[PDB]
Amino acid sequence: QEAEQLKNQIRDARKACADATLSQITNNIDPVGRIQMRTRRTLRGHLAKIYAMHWGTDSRLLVSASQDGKLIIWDSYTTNKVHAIPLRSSWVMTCAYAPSGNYVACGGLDNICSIYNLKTREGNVRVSRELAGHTGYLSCCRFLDDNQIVTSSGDTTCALWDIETGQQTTTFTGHTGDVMSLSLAPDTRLFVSGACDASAKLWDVREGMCRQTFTGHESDINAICFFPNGNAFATGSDDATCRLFDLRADQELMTYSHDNIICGITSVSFSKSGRLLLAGYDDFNCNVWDALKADRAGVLAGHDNRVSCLGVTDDGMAVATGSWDSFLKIWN
Amino acid sequence: CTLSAEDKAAVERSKMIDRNLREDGEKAAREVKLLLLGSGKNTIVKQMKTGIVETHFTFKDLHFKMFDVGAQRSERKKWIHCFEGVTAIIFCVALSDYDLVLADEAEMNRMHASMKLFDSICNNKWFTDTSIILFLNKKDLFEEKIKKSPLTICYPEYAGSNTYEEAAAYIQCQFEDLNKRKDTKEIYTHFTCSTDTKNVQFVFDAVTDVIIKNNLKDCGLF
């Protein structure tokens, strides 16, 4: 009457594929050991709570967004502020850096992810195009090219935007709950999104249909990051745990959790080799997880408030982390 | 020595941007940020002045910036925390709505839903020490309606006089009873839709009292 039998068939089919857990395969892998992560560069200047951080392609420029209506682009090596943009909507909750480094996007509790053009003959960061069309707050806006950007909004819909046209190229509405985070695959042909329904779905950019769904989490998913190989991605939720999902298996291989960790996860990122999972927690600390053996290889406390954002460079040399304490600290 | 000419210029630019950011933060520090919730919200906003609506109004040498978070049907457990540090919360409820059921085959009563929202926000972990400026709107319609249809339908266990004063007092007491942390925060209740800018006067007085009490809680005199 209402597709009762269909749900069980998928469950049985996915169950039949379980042969060996990821833990068994990684038993012979030598432990990474304690990582002597130490703060190297400290960034300050936006007083309000920092909510979003993203590295540039050059691995030296990163963009941060704060609740004081300011997004700051930082020179990672020298800590020099290169740009400070006054946001008309001060409730920014996400930001991104274009692959070419020419454009920057940010979104908040408003229903717009304004596109900022860094490279202008007038030499100022002016609003290029406003991607209005959402009914809820924007959770994450990640660029595909200089003209295409994918946006995640609290209205449960993800929209592909053509910057020049300013209209949604493709709308994804498969999520029942609000989508909180957006992660792009290395090839950019597909992306995955996490939602408050404790599930994540695989989206194909060029066609616009869900290809896979993941439901291992118990609570709202907050952050997601693609594994560097592109065949897997990690999820972070309010369960105080993060999970690894593989696109070719549709199953969770392993979970990253500890007994003494009870608060939710706000951020997640991978190292260039993919052996380390950079996860930001609400206990003011970041835990480095051995992606293979699923063990804590290090801890970055660094902050006096909740870790709100973090990311690894394209070169994989340094990891930046932001927190509601209004500071971003870069570690190596 | 270790920095080149371009490095020196970049450092100068960085410290200039830092100065500008600090100036902007100082300017924003002297702004009273208020959270608005609700039910006569449009009338309240008109008398005070698809995402978050921000309104700025200056009253008696003080700056108020009100954040109406309406039209955000999305789950607020993921963005309610963005409003930490707000001086006070303005909650709007229409008294005349005791006889409405919000359609949906009358699955709920509008007043009951309003008080459920009030309880959820008051007991929220992010506002354990935030005052609430409660507004009871549509008093004239409430009187006109109770003159014919008793409020007992909305409150089956309420047995008392149907006059406006008693019903309004009972509703105000019911709203205040939702406060499970009454010691930490107060609830300033006012009746509107029959009052001119003096609603702004009530808001200003409540904010002033909240500020004074917060200052005292610093010294230990309150």
Partner: single-chain antibody, 232 residues
Framework: VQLVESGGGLVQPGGSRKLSCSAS????????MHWVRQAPEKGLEWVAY????????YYADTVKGRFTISRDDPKNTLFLQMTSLRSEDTAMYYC??????????????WGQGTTLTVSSADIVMTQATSSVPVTPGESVSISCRSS???????????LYWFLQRPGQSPQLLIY???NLASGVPDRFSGSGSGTAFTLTISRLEAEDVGVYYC?????????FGAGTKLEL
């Protein structure tokens, strides 16, 4: 973006004249400003620098003291006070805007300049040939040398290449020896060692003819070579 200079004219020796440049179409406050002179039938020479906010001000040894530079951010105009003009000061000054941050392109825009008719550890930049006859469609190479290693400890080689076509202001081509300037044909390429550098054109075009200039930004006493004049 557009920079218009003013105040040019004939001034007798010992007089004082102020050159004013108007900034329109870009954020004047964000960009620092430079003054580069060009004596008639001669090469370029850096004059003075003023940073955003007037925090940092520098002058060349031959002009230090006599010439002072001030900025007016509210009005988006630049002033360069000049006192006790000498016969050597007879040159046309070109105002240049630069912004300093990783990935930036300093000296990316040059103004028309203002014509003025009057009457030590510094790195010396030399170019291999003052003039070179060339033909369209064939590869062309221009080489220059520096008396000191321009490769700073940070790992960036501060080499700048410029092209000044006849009856036109210089146009930036290469700013750090490896990066092509914005709005320039991809034909131009930059390469070199820590002290020897070469500017090569994969295939010459009619618009490439002109005088090419080299500069180092390792230290503020900027030095401009005699130039390399290409003739078709």
């Amino acid at each position: 973006v557009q920079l218009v200079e003013s105040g040019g004219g004939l001034v007798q020796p010992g007089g004082s004249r102020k050159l004013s440049c108007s900034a329109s179409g870009f954020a004047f406050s964000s960009f620092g400003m430079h003054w580069v002179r060009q004596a008639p039938e001669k090469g370029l020479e850096w004059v003075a620098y003023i940073s955003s906010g007037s925090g940092t001000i520098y002058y060349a040894d031959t002009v230090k003291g006599r010439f002072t530079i001030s900025r007016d951010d509210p009005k988006n105009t630049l002033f360069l006070q000049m006192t006790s003009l000498r016969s050597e000061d007879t040159a046309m000054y070109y105002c240049v805007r630069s912004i300093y941050y990783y990935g930036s392109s300093p000296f990316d825009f040059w103004g028309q300049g203002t014509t003025l008719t009057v009457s030590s550890a510094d790195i010396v930049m030399t170019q291999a040939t003052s003039s070179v006859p060339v033909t369209p469609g064939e590869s062309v190479s221009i080489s220059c040398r520096s008396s000191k290693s321009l490769l700073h400890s940070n790992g960036n080689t501060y080499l700048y290449w410029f092209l000044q076509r006849p009856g036109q202001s210089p146009q930036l081509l290469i700013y750090r020896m490896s990066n092509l300037a914005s709005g320039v044909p991809d034909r131009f390429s930059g390469s070199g060692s820590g002290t020897a550098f070469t500017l090569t054109i994969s295939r010459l075009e009619a618009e490439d003819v002109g005088v090419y200039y080299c500069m180092q930004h390792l230290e503020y006493p900027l030095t401009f070579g005699a130039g390399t004049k290409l003739e078709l």
